């Protein structure tokens, strides 16, 4: 019940999909990490990666570069370590010295940077999707969040990495894509909709899901 | 390796020896160890992984209790909680957090989440009045995982009082060894010996020490 199953299922689809519809993108999916690579990374960052994340890394060590997630790049373990230390530097500088918010409220710490936010995806422009290993009081450990330069408001986009990868997989399978050989971008197929930034899609989905759930209290 | 396990083992030696010499009645309240099963069961209940030094401490004493008044707590009146009490109280605070009180703050700033209650604040000590010392498994951006904090009903401002449970237990041990106490075998209370200090609430001592340490660190 950690999301490992989803991680594996998701990668099957994503692997098969890219090979069929975008071999060029498939070609960028790296070989697995070894357990040593992971132990080394865990020791460097003084952190324990969630099971589904470890699972994902043992399938592909990121990408080697048009990014897989509708333009956003799956980070290599080395990139994860480098960027995590980058964010850790930011958090220290901030210690000494734009309202930070969270959807759902109190799910994610209301801060610009946290040492326990491990980035796994990048827009190569300062923004990330990653795992939250230090949730707010109404958050969940190893929930998947957006954070970064332009993420003054953070979003919980999935309960775990597995469910994130799967919802991406389901978008591919549902035909919610346009090619621009080309660059992969999101469009909602059922609505006959325009091209949209995938972060905007994830944000709207989080926002909607939050709202449909508010009624329930118990 | 650098988690405070050493310090936990060392501390409990000085604390076991001290109580036996200066307050056998208090020594008598220190429970037998937990088994690994007790701990695994607790970890499974709370869906949480206890830090190493905490596990170590539990495998020396499962808190304190006595049938015979109420329990005179080890930490200058504050009671070391049994694993059962830890599980029960953690679930109690988890209920509070779900149901959710002035501005919540942290010393050092941003070391502790600025909230009244968090599911990952595991209480280990109680004043039996709503307040705790415990482990923070979800620190703020300038905090440290498994740092030791004050929280509870009267702790709108939270304090990081140690880097880990080991260092906490040891600094308590050092207070005992420095003669910073007074018996009222009666009830154990804090006083600073080296200066001829008054009787003080131990929470007030820890708060002042944290505040001072924060300044010119």
UniProtKB/Swiss-Prot annotation, chain A:
Lineage: Eukaryota, Fungi, Dikarya, Ascomycota, Saccharomycotina
Source species, domain of life: Eukaryota
Quaternary structure and partners: Interacts with TYS1.
Function per UniProt: Protein involved in the regulation of cell wall assembly and 1,3-beta-glucan synthesis, possibly through the transcriptional regulation of cell wall glucan and chitin synthesis.
Range of the intact protein held here: 84 to 340 of 505
UniProt-recorded name of the protein: Cell wall assembly regulator SMI1
Family: Belongs to the KNR4/SMI1 family.
Localization of this protein: Nucleus
Note: Present with 5680 molecules/cell in log phase SD medium.
């Amino acid at each position: 019940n950690d999301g490992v199953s989803e991680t594996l299922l998701a990668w099957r689809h994503i692997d098969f999909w890219t090979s069929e519809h975008n071999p060029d993108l498939n070609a960028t999916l790296s070989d697995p990490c070894t357990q040593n690579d992971i132990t080394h990374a865990e020791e460097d960052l003084e952190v324990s990666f969630p099971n589904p994340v470890k699972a994902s890394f043992k399938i592909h060590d990121g990408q080697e570069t048009s990014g897989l997630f509708y333009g956003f790049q799956l980070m290599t373990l080395d990139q994860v370590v480098a960027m995590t230390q980058a964010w850790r530097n930011v958090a220290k500088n901030l210690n000494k010295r734009p309202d930070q918010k969270s959807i759902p409220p109190n799910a994610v710490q209301p801060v610009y940077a946290h040492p326990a936010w491990i980035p796994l995806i990048t827009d190569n422009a300062g923004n990330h999707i990653g795992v939250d290993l230090a949730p707010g009081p109404n958050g969940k450990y190893a929930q998947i969040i957006t954070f970064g330069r332009d993420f003054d408001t953070k979003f919980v986009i999935a309960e775990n990495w597995g469910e994130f990868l799967l919802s991406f997989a389901n978008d591919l399978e549902a035909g919610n894509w346009y090619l621009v050989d080309g660059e992969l971008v999101f469009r909602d197929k059922k609505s006959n909709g325009p091209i949209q930034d995938y972060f905007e899609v994830l944000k709207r989905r989080t926002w909607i899901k939050y709202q449909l759930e508010r009624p329930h209290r118990d």
